[PDB]
UniProtKB/Swiss-Prot annotation, chain A:
Residue window of the full protein shown: 720 to 767 of 1273
Protein name (Swiss-Prot/TrEMBL): Spike protein S2
Protein role: Precursor of the fusion protein processed in the biosynthesis of the S protein and the formation of virus particle. Mediates fusion of the virion and cellular membranes by functioning as a class I viral fusion protein. Contains two viral fusion peptides that are unmasked after cleavage. The S2/S2' cleavage occurs during virus entry at the cell membrane by host TMPRSS2 or during endocytosis by host CSTL.
Disulfide bonds: 19-41, 24-30
Lineage: superkingdom: Viruses
Length: 48, 48
């Protein structure tokens, strides 16, 4: 009578990202400049 | 230029010798050397 071990992954860690903090940070001028590019943030948020 | 009193433990704007930023200032236990002025983190942003 033998006993064997098998290991299988199931889940994965969940992450969230912020656009303005990563790209611009603590500068308002960069935010006002970045407001005129598009809506990539919506796509990133939806995927995550 | 002018000068102003130092406030701590409140989110404020600071201009240290031309270095502009927004954040909260705290007493530090770090030890510097006579030829050093500030430190940096992994992403080359000032922390001390």
């Amino acid at each position: 009578i033998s006993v064997t071990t098998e290991i299988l992954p199931v889940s994965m860690t969940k992450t969230s990202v912020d656009c303005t903090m990563y790209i611009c940070g603590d500068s308002t001028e960069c935010s006002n400049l970045l407001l005129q590019y598009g809506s990539f943030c919506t796509q990133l948020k939806r995927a995550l | 230029k002018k000068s102003t009193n130092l406030v701590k433990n409140k989110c404020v704007n600071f201009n240290f010798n031309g270095l502009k930023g927004t954040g909260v200032l705290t007493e530090s236990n770090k030890k510097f050397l006579p030829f050093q002025q500030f430190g940096r983190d992994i992403a080359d942003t000032t922390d001390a």
